[PDB]
């Protein structure tokens, strides 16, 4: 019942197969037998497809596979056996897969990878995923023997009971290691074994409240780790300080991320300057998303973080209930160039303290997207302290109408006012602008002369008339989809002499011929410039298809 295309890609997915279909051929390049009910794979089921490159067997109900089932798949590059019922793995399955690049064994109920190294013959392996949520409980030294370099290694071990020291040490290089660990018990041992190989370590769902640092029993070496991320972790202010002590081993770390974590303030954590980490090495990017701090009144005089972020260039603290960045802290972020405080609780009065006289000295880009700002004039006035600011994003803030006169940072060339509920644009917006986004608002027209404007985004508004071409003599990009445009003045787009891209779709274009002639002809001569396709109101026919005699 399977169907193959002309390139040997065959689909046998979501059938009710209870066994590998018979009559497979050497012409098959890809076989998808996922979501079936193939309980057993025998000695000869896959012997005929010797040229197979891709074999997907996800979520079928495989519980038994004969040891030599893959003997003729010497050209196989992708094998997905994830989410099946394999409670035991056999080294025999992989012995003949010399061309294998991707192997997914995750989601099967085995407790360990077995007593025999499974991957020594997989010399070309690039991606390996293993483990499960409830049963994988031990990682052994023999587990990764034979593997030298991997682009991605994912180990799901939420129920881990034991990690044999040095298990991960035999791997020479790992570009991205993803570890699902529920407890911090083996973190020091694991960390010690990946110091020479891992370039990006990602730790998921780890409760690190009990984590405590101790120098590692390993020889000194230059670690290639550049990125470290924690996803869904639980920390205490004390354990966080302990984690920072690991930085001494990863001197090239440049980026750190904390997503969906929770930080608990002990309330007794009174560390001396001796045990407190105040240096952050070469970390230049810090990204925090959805951080939950239960009781902030349980933290001490957090001034150590001031010396911690002095060299950081990019900081993101998104959707974490931030309502204030104290002035003294802002003054210490001397190297900061990009600051994103999207989806927080910032209001003008507190932003005024956050952006005090010498705050964020080097700042070039400030994102205050989804906050509680109400006045564009007051916001611009407050930000005059940021002398080097060139880009400002205040989108998704509910602003009252803007006035005719406003003060803004002198170098500001980018301003995002998308989704701010504005009904009119006034001269509050400066002529220094090169990029303006006023999309998703309630605008009925646009008449602002912005001589240096290179990009205008005004999609999702209520314009019934295209803004005058003379308003943007050097415009490169115009986005005006989803408005209420029915026509355009003859020759208008040819007057946008620098135009490179334009979005005109989702508008009720009137394709009656003694009117749509110019637009249809322009679209035919400028297909490269159009993004999306303008369609006629009613028929839904592409505007370009219309030809007026
Ligand atoms: N005086 C007052 C007394 O309480 C302060 S007002 C409190 C404000 C201040 O919030 C601020 O100072 C935020 C300013 C924005 C920039 C923060 C950068 C911090 C990065 C974290 C270090 C990264 C190191 C990585 C190393 C590998 O928060 C507030 O506005 C109210 C409290 C809500 C939460 C605020 C954000 C919490 C920041 C915690 C930082 C540590 C996170 C650890 C995660 C595991
Ligand atoms: C961020 O913006 C600030 C703007 O204040 C930049 O700092 C300012 O840099 C200028 C030029 O280097 C300094 O002006 C100089 O003042 C002396 C007076 O002693 C004068 O003789 C010179 O002719 C010149 O006008 C100014 O003092 C300084 N502002 C401060 C901090 O007081 C800063 O360079 C920008 N950061 C980056 C990396 O873009
Ligand atoms: C002006 O600000 C706009 C509002 O933020 C911005 O549009 C938004 O751009 C982001 C970034 O791509 C989109 O985010 C999408 O991707 C993230 C991460 O994968 C998801 O979490 C989001 O749900 C979303 O799928 C937003 O969708 C998009 N908002 C919309 C609907 O417009 C503009 O790009 C900014 N203008 C300029 C010129 O930079
Ligand atoms: C891989 O298969 C070859 C087949 O000749 C076998 O000799 C070898 O032991 C297997 N794994 C190793 C150790 O390379």
XYZ file of C-alpha atoms and ligand atoms in Angstrom:
686
model
C 0.000 0.000 0.000
C 3.068 2.238 0.101
C 3.603 4.874 -2.581
C 6.931 6.140 -3.905
C 7.696 9.209 -5.984
C 10.142 9.349 -8.900
C 13.104 9.888 -6.573
C 12.680 6.709 -4.544
C 11.056 8.466 -1.583
C 8.360 6.090 -0.321
C 5.501 6.779 2.075
C 4.132 3.922 4.179
C 3.146 6.067 7.139
C 0.055 5.725 9.332
C -1.054 2.552 7.603
C -2.004 -0.405 9.757
C 1.120 -2.372 8.885
C 1.793 -5.160 11.382
C 5.060 -6.018 9.659
C 7.534 -4.474 7.226
C 5.810 -4.598 3.822
C 7.118 -7.252 1.440
C 8.547 -6.578 -2.005
C 10.874 -3.702 -1.104
C 13.423 -2.763 -3.781
C 16.921 -1.450 -4.428
C 15.364 1.643 -6.024
C 14.066 2.860 -2.672
C 16.013 5.779 -1.210
C 13.728 6.778 1.656
C 11.214 4.722 3.586
C 8.753 6.175 6.067
C 7.008 3.427 8.036
C 6.220 5.571 11.076
C 3.045 5.328 13.153
C 2.284 1.730 12.232
C 2.088 -1.377 14.428
C 5.194 -3.280 13.393
C 5.987 -5.305 16.496
C 8.807 -7.377 14.997
C 11.464 -6.819 12.319
C 12.995 -10.053 11.032
C 16.230 -11.166 9.402
C 15.135 -10.509 5.833
C 12.510 -7.753 5.983
C 14.970 -5.032 4.933
C 17.490 -7.062 2.937
C 16.199 -5.963 -0.485
C 16.520 -2.187 -0.030
C 20.315 -2.032 -0.174
C 20.414 1.577 -1.419
C 18.125 2.989 1.280
C 19.402 6.312 2.661
C 16.543 7.206 5.013
C 14.538 4.909 7.291
C 11.901 6.437 9.561
C 10.253 4.015 11.974
C 9.029 6.401 14.660
C 6.110 5.446 16.895
C 5.482 2.085 15.360
C 5.218 -0.566 18.023
C 8.596 -2.168 17.506
C 9.693 -4.273 20.458
C 11.902 -6.803 18.673
C 14.525 -6.414 15.942
C 16.730 -9.327 14.875
C 20.434 -8.606 15.283
C 21.190 -8.671 11.542
C 18.028 -6.870 10.407
C 20.067 -3.954 9.002
C 22.885 -5.980 7.396
C 22.398 -4.591 3.877
C 21.770 -0.944 4.795
C 25.376 0.099 4.257
C 24.232 3.325 2.585
C 21.745 4.337 5.287
C 22.311 7.875 6.571
C 19.225 8.495 8.743
C 17.653 6.019 11.175
C 14.803 7.093 13.428
C 13.659 4.423 15.891
C 12.372 6.943 18.423
C 9.263 6.318 20.517
C 9.022 2.579 20.019
C 8.990 -0.246 22.564
C 12.656 -1.261 22.497
C 13.620 -2.195 26.064
C 16.992 -3.609 25.001
C 19.466 -2.374 22.373
C 21.745 -4.605 20.302
C 25.192 -3.599 19.035
C 24.554 -5.921 16.073
C 22.008 -3.513 14.588
C 24.544 -0.752 14.076
C 27.607 -2.733 13.051
C 26.808 -2.513 9.320
C 25.661 1.126 9.246
C 28.938 2.730 8.133
C 27.203 5.621 6.350
C 24.929 6.558 9.251
C 24.850 10.286 10.072
C 21.666 10.567 12.182
C 20.439 8.096 14.820
C 17.457 8.667 17.119
C 16.852 6.050 19.833
C 15.044 8.365 22.240
C 11.671 7.484 23.726
C 12.272 3.731 24.013
C 11.977 2.067 27.453
C 15.554 0.765 27.887
C 17.329 1.315 31.237
C 20.813 1.495 29.718
C 22.424 1.240 26.298
C 23.449 -2.308 27.150
C 26.666 -4.140 28.029
C 28.277 -3.678 24.601
C 29.332 -0.412 22.952
C 26.697 0.362 20.319
C 28.409 2.992 18.174
C 32.073 2.171 17.456
C 31.290 1.329 13.821
C 29.386 4.589 13.208
C 32.432 6.585 12.053
C 30.298 9.142 10.171
C 27.687 9.786 12.880
C 26.798 13.470 13.336
C 23.641 13.360 15.494
C 22.729 10.938 18.293
C 19.661 11.118 20.543
C 19.138 8.602 23.384
C 17.238 8.139 26.619
C 13.709 8.623 27.894
C 11.792 10.190 30.777
C 11.056 7.299 33.150
C 13.516 4.410 32.785
C 16.946 5.306 31.400
C 18.887 5.169 34.662
C 22.584 4.589 33.982
C 25.304 5.946 31.697
C 28.461 3.841 31.463
C 32.044 4.297 30.332
C 31.560 1.884 27.433
C 28.519 3.770 26.112
C 30.284 6.194 23.768
C 33.404 4.253 22.823
C 34.352 4.745 19.186
C 32.656 8.129 18.772
C 35.099 10.929 17.982
C 33.073 13.937 16.821
C 29.363 14.748 16.958
C 27.437 17.810 15.854
C 24.621 16.990 18.253
C 24.335 14.627 21.216
C 21.084 14.635 23.191
C 20.731 12.521 26.324
C 17.370 12.367 28.078
C 18.129 11.132 31.592
C 15.500 12.563 33.933
C 15.496 9.295 35.904
C 19.281 8.841 35.993
C 20.512 6.827 39.004
C 24.195 6.690 38.097
C 26.721 8.286 35.766
C 30.054 6.462 35.586
C 32.848 9.024 35.736
C 34.615 9.587 32.411
C 31.793 8.159 30.264
C 31.558 11.353 28.179
C 35.322 12.015 28.209
C 36.180 9.744 25.270
C 34.340 11.972 22.772
C 36.749 14.454 21.185
C 34.281 17.087 19.949
C 30.585 17.807 20.532
C 29.104 20.922 18.992
C 25.858 20.793 20.933
C 25.226 18.608 23.971
C 21.683 18.579 25.317
C 21.235 16.918 28.709
C 17.848 16.348 30.333
C 18.711 15.953 34.032
C 16.236 16.356 36.882
C 18.824 16.601 39.678
C 22.290 18.139 40.049
C 23.870 15.065 41.679
C 26.085 14.178 38.703
C 26.630 17.650 37.258
C 30.201 18.064 38.595
C 31.185 14.629 37.232
C 29.567 15.243 33.854
C 30.891 18.792 33.585
C 34.428 17.539 34.268
C 34.178 15.030 31.401
C 33.137 17.545 28.740
C 35.649 20.345 29.314
C 37.697 19.587 26.193
C 34.875 18.704 23.811
C 31.583 20.583 24.217
C 31.070 23.902 22.438
C 27.438 24.431 23.524
C 25.955 22.807 26.627
C 22.204 22.877 27.141
C 20.787 21.600 30.455
C 17.052 20.943 30.610
C 14.678 20.653 33.593
C 17.383 20.472 36.251
C 16.647 21.243 39.871
C 19.906 22.955 40.837
C 18.805 24.130 44.282
C 21.214 21.666 45.932
C 24.138 22.261 43.589
C 27.447 23.010 45.289
C 30.795 23.666 43.633
C 34.119 21.986 44.397
C 37.286 22.162 42.295
C 37.232 19.497 39.584
C 39.690 16.550 39.654
C 40.857 17.106 36.082
C 43.993 18.421 34.415
C 43.956 22.030 33.233
C 42.801 22.424 29.633
C 41.455 25.081 27.275
C 37.698 24.490 27.028
C 35.969 25.125 23.686
C 32.647 25.929 25.380
C 31.168 29.132 23.943
C 27.501 28.811 24.929
C 25.679 27.585 28.015
C 21.902 27.373 28.389
C 19.588 26.319 31.220
C 15.943 25.539 30.374
C 13.324 24.999 33.081
C 15.803 24.924 35.973
C 15.193 25.652 39.654
C 17.913 27.707 41.371
C 18.515 29.430 44.708
C 20.597 32.585 45.021
C 23.194 30.427 46.780
C 23.359 27.678 44.153
C 23.470 30.301 41.399
C 26.628 31.683 42.983
C 27.964 28.120 43.096
C 27.234 27.679 39.390
C 29.203 30.825 38.543
C 32.297 29.196 40.041
C 32.316 26.768 37.096
C 33.237 29.660 34.794
C 36.899 29.304 35.766
C 36.894 26.098 33.675
C 35.230 27.540 30.573
C 37.228 30.702 29.917
C 35.905 31.159 26.357
C 32.231 31.193 27.386
C 30.612 34.068 25.494
C 26.876 33.442 25.807
C 24.558 32.258 28.562
C 20.804 31.693 28.465
C 18.214 30.960 31.176
C 14.726 30.062 29.874
C 11.707 29.322 32.096
C 13.794 29.069 35.251
C 12.822 29.818 38.836
C 15.178 31.486 41.296
C 14.432 31.119 45.008
C 15.850 33.571 47.511
C 17.004 31.546 50.514
C 16.729 34.427 52.965
C 19.763 33.376 54.991
C 22.294 33.461 52.165
C 24.778 35.965 53.585
C 28.028 35.213 51.705
C 31.330 36.940 52.410
C 33.170 38.650 49.552
C 35.441 35.587 49.494
C 32.914 32.995 48.299
C 31.110 35.443 46.027
C 31.827 35.321 42.292
C 32.181 38.826 40.852
C 33.845 38.227 37.473
C 32.086 36.945 34.351
C 35.041 36.309 32.069
C 34.383 36.866 28.375
C 30.615 36.433 28.599
C 29.197 39.159 26.383
C 25.614 37.971 25.837
C 23.133 37.178 28.608
C 19.614 36.089 27.706
C 16.885 35.551 30.288
C 13.330 34.610 29.346
C 10.372 34.021 31.654
C 12.310 34.078 34.918
C 10.227 33.552 38.052
C 11.507 35.065 41.302
C 9.026 34.074 44.074
C 10.137 36.348 46.907
C 12.653 38.986 45.871
C 12.750 40.295 49.446
C 14.758 37.165 50.276
C 17.924 38.349 48.510
C 20.857 40.257 50.020
C 22.438 43.505 48.822
C 22.775 42.326 45.225
C 25.583 44.696 44.249
C 27.943 41.933 43.148
C 25.998 41.637 39.899
C 27.207 45.167 39.137
C 30.780 43.954 38.650
C 29.457 40.829 36.936
C 27.924 42.550 33.912
C 30.410 45.394 33.283
C 31.721 43.822 30.072
C 28.444 42.353 28.789
C 27.416 43.734 25.389
C 23.926 42.253 24.958
C 21.306 41.608 27.631
C 17.773 40.313 27.247
C 15.419 39.972 30.214
C 12.079 39.080 28.662
C 8.694 38.483 30.300
C 10.159 38.431 33.806
C 8.027 41.062 35.573
C 10.754 43.700 35.486
C 9.501 47.130 36.567
C 12.805 48.772 37.363
C 16.496 48.645 36.462
C 18.043 50.748 39.239
C 20.125 53.705 38.060
C 23.345 52.636 39.786
C 23.072 49.226 38.130
C 22.440 50.792 34.718
C 25.496 53.029 35.178
C 27.675 49.945 35.691
C 26.723 48.358 32.348
C 29.413 50.351 30.558
C 29.835 47.992 27.596
C 26.153 47.283 26.964
C 25.109 47.902 23.338
C 21.799 46.013 23.145
C 19.122 45.797 25.855
C 15.815 43.966 25.384
C 13.231 44.278 28.174
C 10.244 43.017 26.153
C 7.032 41.945 27.915
C 7.709 43.492 31.293
C 6.128 46.129 33.553
C 8.035 49.296 32.646
C 6.229 52.627 33.006
C 7.724 56.069 32.393
C 8.377 57.057 36.030
C 10.567 54.017 36.605
C 12.142 54.102 33.143
C 13.309 57.590 34.133
C 15.376 56.075 36.952
C 16.496 53.144 34.794
C 17.721 55.486 32.068
C 19.358 58.031 34.374
C 22.090 60.503 33.339
C 24.915 58.026 32.728
C 22.878 54.844 32.284
C 23.771 52.316 29.566
C 26.491 54.705 28.199
C 27.280 52.656 25.096
C 23.693 51.595 24.343
C 22.745 51.546 20.652
C 19.581 49.435 20.700
C 16.789 49.475 23.273
C 13.730 47.202 23.064
C 10.809 48.088 25.361
C 8.199 46.330 23.240
C 5.382 44.890 25.358
C 5.450 47.076 28.476
C 3.231 49.710 30.127
C 4.378 52.942 28.468
C 1.577 55.460 27.781
C 3.241 58.583 26.386
C 5.585 58.731 23.394
C 6.561 62.311 24.210
C 7.504 61.484 27.800
C 9.310 58.314 26.695
C 11.414 60.141 24.120
C 12.245 62.867 26.649
C 13.342 60.317 29.239
C 15.616 58.557 26.759
C 17.560 61.721 25.847
C 20.114 60.455 28.383
C 21.105 57.718 25.913
C 23.388 59.711 23.607
C 24.459 56.794 21.404
C 21.025 55.213 20.908
C 20.314 54.509 17.250
C 17.394 52.059 17.465
C 14.293 52.085 19.684
C 11.457 49.544 19.769
C 8.378 50.633 21.743
C 5.908 48.461 19.868
C 3.017 46.776 21.642
C 2.636 49.597 24.182
C -0.753 51.322 24.428
C 0.108 54.943 23.682
C -2.154 57.972 23.919
C -2.109 60.147 20.773
C 1.314 61.612 19.940
C 1.818 65.408 19.812
C 3.301 67.561 17.039
C 6.580 68.148 18.883
C 8.832 65.550 20.493
C 12.454 65.246 21.584
C 14.292 61.990 20.765
C 17.897 60.730 20.938
C 19.716 62.575 18.141
C 21.156 59.478 16.451
C 17.886 57.525 16.436
C 17.408 56.072 12.937
C 15.117 53.131 13.718
C 11.755 53.440 15.496
C 9.227 50.644 15.951
C 5.704 51.848 16.788
C 3.948 48.691 15.637
C 0.770 47.751 17.517
C 0.594 50.919 19.614
C -3.005 51.773 18.770
C -2.144 55.084 17.116
C -4.735 56.642 14.810
C -2.549 59.383 13.342
C 1.158 60.008 12.763
C 2.428 63.511 13.540
C 5.735 65.369 13.412
C 6.564 63.837 16.808
C 8.308 61.259 14.612
C 11.760 62.710 13.662
C 13.134 63.260 10.138
C 16.329 61.501 11.211
C 14.504 58.198 10.705
C 15.726 55.638 8.186
C 13.356 52.892 9.390
C 9.806 53.332 10.670
C 7.358 50.607 11.595
C 3.779 51.752 12.196
C 2.128 48.488 11.223
C -0.860 46.954 12.969
C -2.353 50.264 14.087
C -5.501 52.261 13.249
C -4.087 54.627 10.614
C -6.332 55.974 7.843
C -3.495 57.842 6.110
C 0.208 58.737 6.209
C 1.405 62.210 5.196
C 4.736 62.542 6.986
C 7.711 63.681 4.902
C 10.663 61.528 6.008
C 13.477 62.398 3.529
C 15.917 59.759 4.782
C 13.425 56.911 5.166
C 14.630 53.631 3.669
C 11.936 51.358 5.099
C 8.281 51.957 5.934
C 6.145 49.186 7.415
C 2.489 50.229 7.533
C 0.772 46.887 6.940
C -2.451 46.070 8.779
C -3.936 49.561 8.928
C -6.920 51.229 7.263
C -5.346 53.186 4.418
C -7.631 53.609 1.415
C -5.038 55.650 -0.420
C -1.379 54.850 -0.951
C 0.778 57.508 0.709
C 2.285 60.041 -1.718
C 5.437 58.766 -3.446
C 7.130 62.144 -2.945
C 7.163 61.514 0.821
C 9.945 58.929 0.520
C 12.465 59.830 -2.227
C 14.994 57.169 -1.195
C 12.661 54.435 0.044
C 13.985 50.886 -0.378
C 11.182 48.913 1.280
C 7.451 49.526 1.611
C 5.111 47.142 3.407
C 1.467 48.049 2.969
C -0.362 44.749 2.882
C -3.656 44.216 4.709
C -5.039 47.730 4.302
C -8.026 48.818 2.204
C -6.329 49.841 -1.027
C -8.488 49.417 -4.125
C -6.231 51.252 -6.580
C -3.061 53.323 -6.966
C -2.278 56.521 -8.922
C -0.829 55.853 -12.381
C 2.965 55.702 -12.385
C 3.342 55.900 -8.604
C 5.672 52.935 -8.072
C 8.015 54.129 -10.809
C 8.446 57.242 -8.662
C 9.899 55.131 -5.820
C 13.250 55.197 -7.604
C 15.172 53.191 -4.991
C 12.444 50.630 -4.283
C 13.784 47.111 -3.819
C 10.879 45.317 -2.113
C 7.158 45.910 -1.693
C 4.315 44.059 0.055
C 0.952 44.798 -1.590
C -0.995 41.653 -0.749
C -4.254 41.286 1.166
C -5.783 44.487 -0.209
C -9.160 44.727 -2.020
C -7.671 45.551 -5.432
C -10.289 46.618 -7.976
C -9.279 44.750 -11.121
C -11.740 46.442 -13.481
C -9.625 47.113 -16.571
C -10.050 50.775 -17.294
C -8.337 51.200 -13.905
C -6.072 48.275 -12.974
C -3.945 48.651 -16.127
C -0.925 50.429 -14.597
C -0.715 48.271 -11.472
C -1.050 44.980 -13.351
C 1.607 46.104 -15.856
C 3.957 47.331 -13.128
C 3.676 44.042 -11.245
C 4.552 42.160 -14.446
C 7.705 44.210 -14.981
C 8.713 44.137 -11.307
C 7.933 40.599 -10.151
C 11.276 40.497 -8.333
C 10.248 43.401 -6.087
C 6.864 42.054 -4.989
C 6.692 40.008 -1.794
C 3.594 37.824 -1.769
C 0.994 38.241 -4.509
C -1.584 41.000 -4.854
C -4.989 39.511 -5.668
C -8.193 40.911 -7.137
C -11.101 41.568 -4.790
C -13.740 38.887 -5.228
C -12.289 36.561 -7.861
C -9.032 36.176 -5.945
C -7.178 36.190 -9.261
C -3.587 37.534 -9.179
C -3.474 41.212 -10.147
C -0.558 40.466 -12.498
C -2.717 38.066 -14.528
C -4.980 40.912 -15.623
C -4.295 42.329 -19.085
C -6.163 45.458 -20.199
C -6.530 46.110 -23.942
N 16.868 48.216 44.986
C 16.043 47.044 44.734
C 15.948 45.948 45.795
O 15.292 44.925 45.594
C 16.195 46.481 43.316
S 14.685 46.557 42.319
C 14.699 44.926 41.549
C 14.561 44.954 40.034
C 15.924 44.906 39.363
O 15.910 43.917 38.344
C 17.000 43.956 37.626
O 18.066 44.358 38.097
C 16.971 43.466 36.189
C 17.712 44.385 35.238
C 17.825 43.772 33.848
C 19.191 43.133 33.607
C 19.411 41.908 34.487
C 20.721 41.206 34.155
C 20.973 40.050 35.107
C 21.589 38.848 34.407
C 21.787 37.703 35.391
C 23.252 37.309 35.523
C 23.713 36.446 34.362
C 25.030 35.768 34.695
C 25.311 34.597 33.772
C 26.586 33.877 34.187
C 26.794 32.544 33.508
O 13.787 43.853 39.583
C 12.535 44.189 39.437
O 12.195 45.052 38.625
C 11.473 43.492 40.264
C 11.785 42.018 40.485
C 11.315 41.171 39.310
C 12.454 40.384 38.668
C 13.504 41.301 38.056
C 14.486 40.536 37.170
C 15.346 39.567 37.968
C 16.830 39.692 37.619
C 17.635 38.560 38.255
C 19.038 38.437 37.669
C 19.646 37.069 37.978
C 18.923 35.969 37.204
C 19.464 34.582 37.524
C 18.744 33.515 36.707
C 19.145 32.096 37.045
C 28.290 57.358 24.102
O 27.885 58.727 24.043
C 28.734 59.583 24.846
C 28.155 60.979 24.753
O 28.340 61.686 25.968
C 30.200 59.531 24.357
O 31.049 60.209 25.316
C 31.443 61.516 25.041
O 32.489 61.481 24.067
C 32.879 62.804 23.635
C 33.880 62.619 22.517
O 34.806 61.591 22.834
C 33.463 63.617 24.804
O 33.630 64.989 24.376
C 34.895 65.563 24.453
O 34.906 66.450 25.584
C 36.177 67.120 25.757
C 36.086 67.932 27.034
O 37.086 67.543 27.965
C 36.490 67.998 24.539
O 37.764 68.605 24.701
C 36.485 67.148 23.267
O 36.617 67.996 22.134
C 35.175 66.352 23.159
O 34.097 67.244 22.900
C 32.526 63.588 26.030
O 33.239 64.057 27.170
C 31.956 62.183 26.323
N 30.862 62.290 27.269
C 31.048 61.992 28.550
C 30.931 60.530 28.953
O 31.304 62.844 29.403
C 30.687 58.078 24.207
O 31.921 58.074 23.501
C 29.667 57.200 23.465
N 30.062 55.807 23.537
C 30.352 55.136 22.430
C 31.350 53.995 22.555
O 29.857 55.405 21.338
C 8.475 45.844 15.209
O 8.020 45.099 16.339
C 7.139 44.026 15.955
C 6.493 43.515 17.224
O 7.417 42.761 17.987
C 7.927 42.978 15.150
O 7.074 41.863 14.779
C 7.203 40.680 15.511
O 8.450 40.068 15.177
C 8.723 38.901 15.989
C 10.120 38.432 15.624
O 10.088 37.560 14.502
C 7.655 37.811 15.759
O 7.862 36.719 16.696
C 7.541 35.433 16.262
O 8.597 34.518 16.637
C 8.710 34.307 18.066
C 9.876 33.360 18.287
O 9.820 32.247 17.401
C 7.406 33.733 18.622
O 7.528 33.524 20.023
C 6.263 34.704 18.342
O 5.035 34.142 18.787
C 6.180 34.981 16.832
O 5.753 33.803 16.159
C 6.238 38.389 15.936
O 5.283 37.444 15.467
C 6.059 39.715 15.175
N 4.789 40.322 15.527
C 3.926 40.652 14.572
C 2.679 39.791 14.433
O 4.106 41.600 13.808
C 8.470 43.670 13.888
O 9.294 42.770 13.153
C 9.273 44.939 14.256
N 9.572 45.689 13.052
C 10.813 45.736 12.579
C 11.012 46.438 11.245
O 11.775 45.242 13.168
C 32.518 -2.815 13.177
O 32.389 -3.876 12.216
C 33.637 -4.520 11.897
C 33.341 -5.514 10.790
O 34.536 -6.001 10.202
C 34.209 -5.195 13.142
O 35.443 -5.827 12.825
C 34.424 -4.148 14.236
O 34.825 -4.802 15.433
C 33.129 -3.346 14.493
N 33.393 -2.238 15.401
C 34.625 -1.756 15.559
C 35.362 -2.132 16.836
O 35.173 -1.031 14.727
